[PDB]
């Protein structure tokens, strides 16, 4: 089989021009799609903030309308899902992963309009969920669609387009070209056997959707933190310590989110009316909270820059943390359409900033700025819950642009994945998929 | 399905045994790389020192510059040809082979040969890069601790070999990310599934990067300052630049390969004509490393200078041609030392050139040529070696102008596409494929 290898080596990197062109298209589409989804959620969140002014005096009358529209939008979303496409609830990242191992369907004719409008509902009412869930899943189907509509044949072309789509989807969600590509080749491809995903193809698709994003969002970064200070070597240990805390806590959080799905299922028993009401209940809570205590609701992106600067008290930071662990669970677990990715970054930052404050005070000789621990902690929860550190690390580096913290960032990430492994937690997506694949079988 | 559920719930459980061993592999490879780094400095220094002792009498100095580059060149070409022929050239191809389990990993031989051999070739100012030596050296360090500790298993063998090569690259450019990415882009068995543990690779890299920062802290290999931005009405120019590197990348591969062929005839495989021809080329280098410094050397020096746009356009064309010549001569002649670094230098110079033209055909775009330099820097790595993701990241880690990520990506992709469509192969897969055939043939 040596001869056989000389045959493949000399043949390497020859992805059919057919598939390369289709990636371009997939990326462009997924990009636009994501841009549009992005705009919708802004609009709806803005209406809600508009209506709130119109009832600015009567206080309980205002707390009322904040709830009732988030409630109405949540419901509208939970419904579109439960009725027309149950497989597009929760994240959908686990679902696209299954598609790659060829173990779940890719019902685009259903998912596309459901995930899109459904999330537009849940996200738009200020629920604690992330744009990426909808965009990553949405993107995978857009890649399925152009594979069907163009009747492209062969394992390569099917796995490749489904991949470039999911990439372009993430890329467009954070304006993160690299994170997107890295996502496919770290956590997205079939994890146990070889696959024929063309990385060049993924590239084009991401390039296209990043352009599309930049054409409409140009000149305003999702997060803007300024250039933070540096990291002396006699400081690196502190980041390892921070990694361990995330590592013992990452697995716990996973238990919680899973058990929480189980527990919330008893409330509606699987019943589409108790669900859609319980959904509008949680959603209503969010829009109310998005007004009386705004940092406990929402996606989370607003308070990153605030926490990193060190503008929250320690008490406030503890508050925000607890409040958000509660709302992030409540929203994702209850199977609303929308990812868990983004709110995790938020918890990381807040936790890290907290550690940072303590750190800064026990070690004045180190001349610390708590805002670095915030950045090292930001993608740390993704490292211990998700178990895709390389991807989380690069994602943060593309959004916070303080490359000088690359060593601490890495050390905290590795600190997390190690202690998440040694305290027995599984990758929260492989876990979710594993439940789904059993849930299919266990009842036959 | 009942099979997959089993694997999913079992994923990411690399034995603590292997994770610990990664840490030591990295630490070792780090130190080794640090030491190698220092040696080449020292030897280059002596050459500059002795050069002053003979500062008057011009032809007498041009003589000493040659003779010790010559003497050091030969010393290296020998250590290889005699005690470990498999450690000539890059060794990146040789480690890649080790992963497919198709080449041996003679560390007891390679370690001391590559190390001292390169210290020879590099130290005399030859146009080769530190990474060749370090990457290969790193794999063997990983082989060594696998043997010396008798670790059993396919995983533990493939993993240590990998993390070693990673920590090897990492320490070569203070590039933790580029390191890891290298393994999972261009270094793992490309066609079948393997059991390399990415977590282990991580630890190894962290350890060697710490080692490097412990001794080199407070001075970046390349320093360019924060260049300007990239308007969207400008991206097309980067795609164009990608295409030029894409038609040229395959050409270069032809040249380097055919050059290996051609240089073999001059010595016929004969260890004496080789070592002489080696000290010849190496002599040439240290002479040039004085009379026209930018044509010789690793190349890192002129990046900052070219990116600032301090070279004339004439000078840039000169540097380019001169270097295409010396880079071929040096790597093709099997001298121990990688081809990575000098490639970065060519890209920069080529890009900066394009930049200048670009800047005066489009004053409305308000261009700064220095960005085309940076987008072109890892473009040659994209079209010759064909690992763009790894090249792109590497540059980003050394130049730190993340704001150019899109143009960088576009030029990269522009290259890999046109290298594909004009028939070139991955220069590393090509070299390996020559070696394996030259074996069963």
């Amino acid at each position: 089989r040596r001869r056989q290898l000389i045959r493949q080596l000399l043949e390497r990197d020859k992805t059919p021009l057919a598939i390369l062109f289709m990636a371009a298209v997939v990326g462009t589409l997924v990009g636009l799609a994501a841009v549009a989804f992005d705009k919708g959620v802004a609009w709806l969140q803005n209406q809600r903030m508009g209506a709130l002014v119109h009832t600015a005096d009567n206080y309980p009358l205002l707390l009322t309308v904040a709830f009732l529209c988030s409630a109405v939008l949540a419901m509208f979303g939970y419904f579109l899902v439960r009725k027309y496409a149950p497989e597009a609830g929760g994240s959908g990242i686990p679902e696209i992963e299954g598609a790659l191992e060829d173990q779940r369907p890719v019902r685009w004719w259903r998912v596309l309009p459901v995930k899109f409008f459904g999330g537009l509902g849940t996200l738009g009412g200020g629920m604690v969920l992330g744009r990426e869930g909808p965009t990553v899943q949405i993107g995978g189907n857009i890649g399925r669609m152009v594979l069907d509509i163009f009747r492209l044949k062969g394992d390569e072309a099917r796995h490749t387009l489904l991949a470039t789509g999911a990439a372009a989807g993430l890329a467009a969600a954070f304006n993160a070209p690299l994170a997107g590509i890295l996502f496919i080749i770290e956590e997205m491809r079939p994890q146990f056997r070889y696959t024929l995903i063309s990385i060049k193809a993924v590239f084009i698709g991401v390039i296209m959707s990043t352009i599309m994003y930049r054409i409409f969002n140009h000149e305003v970064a999702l997060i803007d933190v300024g250039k933070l200070s540096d990291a002396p070597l006699n400081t690196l240990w502190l980041y390892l310590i921070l990694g361990i805390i995330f590592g013992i806590f990452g697995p716990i959080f996973n238990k919680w989110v899973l058990g929480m799905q189980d527990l919330l299922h008893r409330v509606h028993g699987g019943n589409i009316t108790k669900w859609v009401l319980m959904g509008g209940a949680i959603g209503g809570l969010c829009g109310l909270l998005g007004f009386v205590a705004p940092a406990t609701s929402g996606g989370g992106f607003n308070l990153i820059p605030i926490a990193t600067a060190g503008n929250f008290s320690m008490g406030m930071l503890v508050f925000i943390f607890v409040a958000r662990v509660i709302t992030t669970l409540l929203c994702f677990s209850s199977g609303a359409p929308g990812g868990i990715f983004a709110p995790m970054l938020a918890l990381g930052t807040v936790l890290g900033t907290a550690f940072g404050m303590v750190a800064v005070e026990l070690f004045p000789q180190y001349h610390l700025e708590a805002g670095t621990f915030a950045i090292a902690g930001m993608g740390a929860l993704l490292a211990a819950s998700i178990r895709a550190p390389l991807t989380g690390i690069i994602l943060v580096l593309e959004m916070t642009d303080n490359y000088q913290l690359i060593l601490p960032m890495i050390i905290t990430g590795l600190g997390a994945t190690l202690l998440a492994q040694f305290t027995g937690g599984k990758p929260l997506w492989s876990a979710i998929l594993a439940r789904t694949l059993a849930k299919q079988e266990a009842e036959q | 399905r009942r099979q997959l559920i089993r694997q999913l719930l079992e994923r990411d459980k690399t034995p603590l045994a292997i994770l610990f061993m990664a840490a030591v592999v990295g630490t070792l490879v780090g130190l080794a790389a640090v030491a190698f780094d220092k040696g080449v400095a020292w030897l280059q220094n002596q050459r500059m020192g002795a050069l002053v002792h003979t500062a008057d009498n011009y032809p007498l100095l041009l003589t000493v510059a040659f003779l010790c580059s010559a003497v050091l060149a030969m010393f290296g070409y020998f250590l290889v040809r005699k005690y470990a022929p498999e450690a000539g050239g890059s060794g990146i191809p040789e480690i890649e082979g080790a992963l497919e389990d198709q080449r041996p990993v003679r560390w007891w031989r390679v370690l001391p040969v590559k190390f001292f051999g390169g210290l020879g070739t590099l130290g005399g100012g030859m146009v080769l890069g530190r990474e060749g030596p370090t990457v290969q050296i790193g794999g063997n360090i990983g082989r060594m601790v696998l043997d010396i500790f008798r670790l059993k298993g396919d995983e533990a063998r493939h993993t240590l070999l990998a993390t070693g090569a990673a920590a090897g690259l990492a320490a070569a450019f203070n590039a933790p990310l580029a390191g890891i990415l290298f393994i999972i882009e261009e270094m793992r068995p490309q066609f079948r599934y393997t059991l390399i543990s990415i977590k282990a690779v991580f630890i190894g890299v962290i350890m060697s990067t710490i080692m490097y920062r412990i001794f080199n802290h407070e001075v970046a290999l390349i320093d360019v300052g924060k260049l300007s931005d990239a308007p969207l009405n400008t991206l097309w120019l980067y795609l164009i630049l990608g295409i030029i590197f894409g038609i040229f990348g395959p050409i270069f591969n032809k040249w380097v390969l055919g050059m290996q062929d051609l240089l073999h005839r001059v010595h016929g495989g004969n260890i004496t004509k080789w070592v002489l021809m080696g000290g010849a080329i190496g002599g040439l280098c240290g002479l040039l490393g004085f009379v026209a410094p930018a044509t010789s050397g690793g190349g890192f020096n002129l990046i900052p200078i070219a990116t600032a746009g301090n070279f004339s356009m004439g000078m840039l064309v000169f540097i380019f041609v001169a270097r295409v010549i010396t880079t071929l001569l040096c790597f093709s002649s099997g001298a121990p030392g990688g081809i990575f670094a000098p490639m970065l230098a060519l890209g920069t110079v080529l890009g900066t050139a394009f930049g200048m033209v670009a800047v005066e055909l489009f004053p409305q775009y308000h261009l700064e040529a220095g960005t085309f330099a940076i987008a072109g820097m890892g473009a040659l790595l994209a079209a010759s070696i064909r690992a763009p993701l790894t090249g792109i990241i590497l540059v980003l880690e050394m130049t730190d102008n993340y704001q150019l990520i899109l143009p960088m990506i576009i030029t990269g992709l522009g290259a890999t596409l046109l290298a594909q469509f004009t028939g070139g192969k991955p220069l590393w897969s090509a070299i390996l494929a020559r070696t394996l055939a030259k074996q069963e043939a």
Partner: antibody, heavy 120, light 107 residues
Framework: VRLLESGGGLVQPGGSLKLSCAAS????????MSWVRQAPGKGLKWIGE????????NYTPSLKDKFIISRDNAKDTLYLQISKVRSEDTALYYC??????????????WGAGTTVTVSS | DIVLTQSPAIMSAAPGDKVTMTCSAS?????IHWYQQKSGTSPKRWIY???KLTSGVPVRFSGSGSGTSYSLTINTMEAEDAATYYC?????????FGGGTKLEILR
């Protein structure tokens, strides 16, 4: 974010003058700077643009040194020497900070203006 | 260097009125910018890349065009709009400014 230009007034026909524009509010490297002018009750005529690293300098069609646009990043200040001055130079001079949208470039934040009066 | 000329040099119109000045250019330009020079103040980036609005510019403002002609439009002009308005291209070099349209309010 403000630009505050200065040093205009009376000049002898034929003599020269250095207008200084001090910037504040924003990082003054990073930015191309420019000068536009307006003669009384008329239109905006562009003069020159200097880049951040003082390496590219462009000018409206003009002769040898009619204009010289320097800048000194140590002081966040732009300058503009005007030479051999004829009465067509009598105008208000704006210092304006450059920037792009999709990439066709615009005069982002404008100064307040200094007035140059060519006379005996 | 592109010669830009502006529709009405001076044009009256009573608040409420939908109002449209024009920028027509000698050769072919694209993505143009519009400045507002209120009387006695300095010019202000108003509309940029032909129809995107500088921040804080009231939505009553619109831009469009292509080719050799562009227009800036106020849908229900309000009295505070009284100004000279300039258009400016930099799609070729050097850049160039319009001649101005001077909006006047009827009351």
């Amino acid at each position: 974010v403000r630009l505050l230009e200065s040093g205009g007034g009376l000049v002898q026909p034929g003599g020269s003058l250095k207008l200084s524009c001090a910037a504040s509010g924003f990082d003054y490297s990073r930015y191309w700077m420019s000068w536009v002018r307006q003669a009384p009750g008329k239109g905006l005529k562009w003069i020159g643009e200097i880049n951040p690293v003082s390496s590219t300098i462009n000018y409206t069609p003009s002769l040898k040194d009619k204009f010289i646009i320097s800048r000194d990043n140590a002081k966040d200040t732009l300058y503009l020497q005007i030479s051999k001055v004829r009465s067509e130079d009598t105008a208000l001079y704006y210092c304006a900070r450059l920037y792009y949208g999709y990439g066709y470039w615009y005069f982002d934040v404008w100064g307040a203006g200094t007035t140059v009066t060519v006379s005996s | 260097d592109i010669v830009l000329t502006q529709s009405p040099a001076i044009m009256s119109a009573a608040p409420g009125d939908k109002v449209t000045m024009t920028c027509s250019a000698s050769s072919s330009v694209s993505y143009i910018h519009w400045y507002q020079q209120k009387s006695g103040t300095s010019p202000k980036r108003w509309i940029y890349d032909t129809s995107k609005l500088t921040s804080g510019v009231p939505v009553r403002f619109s831009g469009s065009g292509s080719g050799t002609s562009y227009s800036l439009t106020i849908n229900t002009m309000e009295a505070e709009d009284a100004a000279t308005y300039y258009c400016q291209q930099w799609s070729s070099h050097p850049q160039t400014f319009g001649g101005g349209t001077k909006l006047e309010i009827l009351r």
